[PDB]
């Protein structure tokens, strides 16, 4: 029954329509988030130092 | 204080010369060791030689650093480029003619 309802949900997702969007694979979500957090902090502190000077 | 990541290496040799190797970088990149910049400075003289490798992006910053560290006010570039450093040294210091007439 689980595989049956899974295939049924696959069909229901196939019949659905949605405006297009774009992204990449799901394995690199947390890594990219951490890199973006680090880059944001670095850019913020650099901009703060430059502004103080 | 201008940039964030930058490597500077000094070498003080006789003939009153200081060799400076600079590896450039910014707040979001690491210093690039493949494209360095070489500077030869002569103490207490208004002249300094540089290797034209990548300073086209950071020329005003290098000029400011040179004119501040050496206690000067202005800096300008001469219309004299050459691959032979000794020839430039002899021409700029105008010591290519070393013959003087004397009876002694």
Curated annotation (Swiss-Prot), chain A:
Q: Which domain of life is it from?
A: Eukaryota
Q: Where in the cell is it found?
A: Nucleus; Chromosome, Centromere
Regarding protein family, the annotation reads: Belongs to the CENP-Q/OKP1 family.
Q: Its biological function?
A: Component of the CENPA-CAD (nucleosome distal) complex, a complex recruited to centromeres which is involved in assembly of kinetochore proteins, mitotic progression and chromosome segregation. May be involved in incorporation of newly synthesized CENPA into centromeres via its interaction with the CENPA-NAC complex. Plays an important role in chromosome congression and in the recruitment of CENP-O complex (which comprises CENPO, CENPP, CENPQ and CENPU), CENPE and PLK1 to the kinetochores.
Tell me how this protein assembles: Component of the CENPA-CAD complex, composed of CENPI, CENPK, CENPL, CENPO, CENPP, CENPQ, CENPR and CENPS. The CENPA-CAD complex interacts with the CENPA-NAC complex, at least composed of CENPA, CENPC, CENPH, CENPM, CENPN, CENPT and CENPU.
Q: What is this protein called?
A: Centromere protein Q
Q: What species does this protein belong to?
A: Homo sapiens (Human)
Which part of the complete protein is shown? 109 to 161 of 268
UniProtKB/Swiss-Prot annotation, chain B:
Q: Which residues form the signal peptide?
A: none
Report the subcellular localization: Nucleus; Chromosome, Centromere, Kinetochore
Question: Quaternary arrangement and interactors, per the entry?
Answer: Component of the CENPA-NAC complex, at least composed of CENPA, CENPC, CENPH, CENPM, CENPN, CENPT and CENPU. The CENPA-NAC complex interacts with the CENPA-CAD complex, composed of CENPI, CENPK, CENPL, CENPO, CENPP, CENPQ, CENPR and CENPS. Interacts directly with CENPA. Identified in a centromere complex containing histones H2A, H2B and H4, and at least CENPA, CENPB, CENPC, CENPT, CENPN, HJURP, SUPT16H, SSRP1 and RSF1.
Tell me which family the UniProt entry assigns to this protein. Answer: Belongs to the CENP-N/CHL4 family.
Q: What does this protein do?
A: Component of the CENPA-NAC (nucleosome-associated) complex, a complex that plays a central role in assembly of kinetochore proteins, mitotic progression and chromosome segregation. The CENPA-NAC complex recruits the CENPA-CAD (nucleosome distal) complex and may be involved in incorporation of newly synthesized CENPA into centromeres. CENPN is the first protein to bind specifically to CENPA nucleosomes and the direct binding of CENPA nucleosomes by CENPN is required for centromere assembly. Required for chromosome congression and efficiently align the chromosomes on a metaphase plate.
Q: What is this protein called?
A: Centromere protein N
């Amino acid at each position: 029954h689980l595989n049956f309802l899974k295939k049924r949900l696959l069909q229901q997702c196939e019949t659905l329509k949605v405006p297009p969007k774009k992204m990449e694979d799901l394995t690199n979500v947390s890594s990219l988030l951490n890199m973006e957090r680090a880059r944001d902090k670095a850019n913020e502190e650099g901009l703060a130092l430059l502004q103080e000077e | 204080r201008a940039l964030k990541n930058v490597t500077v290496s000094f070498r003080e040799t006789e003939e009153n010369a200081v060799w400076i190797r600079i590896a450039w970088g910014t707040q979001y990149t690491k210093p690039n060791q493949y494209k360095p910049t070489y500077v030869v400075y002569y103490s207490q003289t208004p002249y300094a030689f540089t290797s034209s490798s990548m300073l086209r992006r950071n020329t005003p910053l290098l000029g400011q650093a040179l004119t501040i560290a050496s206690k000067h006010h202005q800096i300008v570039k001469m219309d004299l480029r050459s691959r032979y450093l000794d020839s430039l040294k002899a021409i700029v210091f105008k010591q290519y003619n070393q013959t003087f007439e004397t009876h002694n």
